[PDB]
Amino acid sequence: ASKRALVILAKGAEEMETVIPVDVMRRAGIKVTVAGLAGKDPVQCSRDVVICPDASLEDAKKEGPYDVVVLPGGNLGAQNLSESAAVKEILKEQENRKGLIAAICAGPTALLAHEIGFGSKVTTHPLAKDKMMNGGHYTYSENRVEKDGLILTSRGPGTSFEFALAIVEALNGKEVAAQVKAPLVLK
Amino acid sequence: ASKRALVILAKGAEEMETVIPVDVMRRAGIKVTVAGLAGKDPVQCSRDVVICPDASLEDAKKEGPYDVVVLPGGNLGAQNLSESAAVKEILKEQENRKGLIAAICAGPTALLAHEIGFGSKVTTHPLAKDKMMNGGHYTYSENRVEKDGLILTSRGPGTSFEFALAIVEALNGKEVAAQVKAPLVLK
Ligand SMILES: *[C@@]1(=O)C(=O)[N]C2=[C][C]=[C][C]=C21
Ligand SMILES: *[C@@]1(=O)C(=O)[N]C2=[C][C]=[C][C]=C21
Ligand SMILES: [Cl-]
Ligand SMILES: [Cl-]
């Protein structure tokens, strides 16, 4: 059975950090649902790319649970994720079932907001470090991708392929990740 | 005055190769128009990400000319671009005015289709090489980004940041490209 990913798409999300993981995960044969935080309507990302979600979050959450919940960055997207009770509930449920939780750039700051994965080693965008670290609830890392416990984090648009491939590795294994990687012409 | 980019978005385009250049160019302060080949309606990309264009190609072409015309890859997107008379006319006009023409992955094969930039050094995705090289009209390169004459090409999703930053360099200069690069957390 194919693994399943939920990608939560909020206004202000970083579109590169949304599309790279969606695309790479679909290359890996993962069933990905792009779920709109606000509803079924198109979402205006940080640099004005407009993406139409596969479903509302309201609907997607009733088709759970998922093998991974993915939080893109973009500062305003992460703020929107951080303010959402629906997101809080999805993440808590994922944590409780010991499922993978993945977040990139400022995305990890929504984990802080919702009190998810405290005690884990995490990375963020450099400019999001101080926010993430408020209270010392996580241990900070400068690795381009980090993984500790349930929590997989990464730093920025430029680490999005590595982040996505780490998700593929976690779900489908190293060999699939390597096979997906090769045609991409990564460095 | 800000430089202007036209990104032509066809069904089957590689969504990473579409969004990375759009986003990076907008970070560089370039005015980017995402123009739908088929019209104003949302476009289903290769891995099923659905992007809403800023305008139809029909409308965008009347707001030209542009400092760069950008052709994403994705094999079926490039086939759609290659079959379009509107694309042909836009590219011919761009060539005639000695403007930049940029294409990635299989995107450069639409240059072949429309007889654009013959004699230039080009790269493509490795799997698109034989198509591009039919007739020996270009000189092939394995550089991750290549630029010769009017024609800027690149290889795949994994070279999209380098491709986008090369476009920024060409239009706005090396310093702007370097400033845009730094926050991205590239290798
Ligand atoms: C990233 O996408 C984020 O969430 N915050 C930020 C700041 C600068 C560059 C990239 C990012
Ligand atoms: C690329 O996007 C394209 O146009 N053709 C292709 C084949 C394999 C991987 C990436 C690409
Ligand atoms: Cl941002
Ligand atoms: Cl393709």
Domain positions in chain B: 1-187
Cβ-contact A152, A145 below 8 angstroms: yes
- Cα gap B175→B187, rounded to integer Å: 18
Question: Resolution to 1 decimal, in Å?
Answer: 1.4
Beta bridge partners of A101: A69, A151
CA-nearest residue to B52 within chain A is: A50
What is the Cα Rg of chain A in Å? 15
What is the residue type of B8?
I
CA-nearest residue to B161 within chain A is: A158
Instruction: List the single residue in B23, B125, B126 with the smallest CB-CB distance to A47.
Output: B23
Length of chain A counted residue by residue:
187
- What is A1-187's CATH topology? Rossmann fold (3.40.50)
- Give the residue ranges of DSSP H helices in B28-68: 57-61
Query: Could you tell me which residues of chain B have a Cβ less than 8 Å from any Cβ in chain A?
Result: 14-16, 19-20, 22-23, 26-27, 34, 42, 46-52, 125-127, 144, 155-159, 161, 183-187
Report which DSSP code applies to B99. Answer: -
Q: Which residue has the tokens 């790319």?
A: A49
Residues 6+ apart with CB under 8 A from A176: A28, A29, A168, A169
Looking from the CA of residue A77, the nearest atom of ligand 1 is 4
User: A119: exposed, middle or buried (C-beta count within 10 Å: 0-12, 13-18, 19+)?
Assistant: exposed
Which method, experimentally, gave rise to this model?
X-ray
B156 pocket-lining for ligand 2 (C-beta < 6 Å): yes
Report which DSSP code applies to B138. Answer: S
Beta bridge partners of B121: B139
Report which DSSP code applies to A28. Answer: T
| Residue B126 structure tokens | 């490795």
